[model samples]
Target: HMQYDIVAVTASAHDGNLPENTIDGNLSTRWSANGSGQYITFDLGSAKTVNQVKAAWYNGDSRTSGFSISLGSDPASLTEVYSGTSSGQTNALESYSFTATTARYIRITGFGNSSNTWNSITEVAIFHA
Candidate 1:
């Protein structure tokens, strides 16, 4: 098991929510997006075998959520590796896994939630298998 380190993180839009809140090790502090087509990018610093990503949704309960994970060397041109949709659950830790791929950056985007346009994320973690 290889532990992946997130060297950098960024988001498309945030009001009072900072992208660093997602990895602050505190579930209470969350990162939120203002509206649809918003995204959060994580850079592992260098290419590594990435197999899974665990994301905790803030106020996931009763929110129809859809998101996609993209991987690439550059954030401007990432390839979608996984996509998921959920029908809302409180504090849900949604896990997405895919075939092992070597990439330095991973971007998670909200496809628009049913409840609202906001993308509330409590936490995000990357791992290798």
Candidate 2:
């Protein structure tokens, strides 16, 4: 069997985006009611020579926006992996993919436009291609 590891973690605060005090392992914060979104990322142990992802979103008591997924070798530069709606989701897991090998990190960006409410992501997983 193949086992993966979690290298990093963070919380998407509901009151605001990743707060300056955001710590690893904290409950995802609720996004602002005005349309702001949040994100969290993972550093795959090795460059996954694949094009798919497993993402989980937390459903708040209220609804929120869809999310965007991105990948990159460095944290600063991310190439969008996928984007889709996340409303009407209580607890959901979705998968998406693309072709690339130089990726070391993948970011899950959750956001909602019109009203600023979005999903609270609990997990972001990467797979071997």
Candidate 3:
């Protein structure tokens, strides 16, 4: 696990293509990738100075290939902050952070195997510490 330089203000999932309530709030039934990139986005809901974001694949299965987190000051324009491979079935945190940011929203996007797609998100949270 990586450490942070500042205090992280916890951020939660508002909703993606599917409501979290559909999957016992542990995962998403509707939010996923289908050959294309699937994403789950959350707004800080307010202007907040931020630095890091973290997530886990709790709601759904897992992907062997591409998984990532993008960040931006606006929903329309986002920058890829961090990208990593899934560590499947491990109840641990996947984290992404920058040295500085003035963002209002962050999106977690997933891309799966080249032959097919299989990406899903269970829980996502952001931090501004």
Local accuracy by lDDT, each model = 0.85, 0.55, 0.54
- In order of appearance, the predictions have TM-scores of 0.92, 0.62, 0.64
TM-score of 3: 0.64
Clash count per candidate: 1, 8, 5
Task: Give the per-residue lDDT digits (tens) of candidate 3, residues 26-45.
Answer: 54333444544656666665
Question: What's the lDDT for residue 33 in model 1?
Answer: 85
Tens-digit lDDT track for model 1 on 27-64? 78888886778999998998988998888887777676
lDDT of 2 by residue, 21-62 (tens): 222333363223224456666666566554767654445324
**Which 10 consecutive residues of model 2 have the lowest summed lDDT?**
18-27
Highest TM-score: which candidate? 1
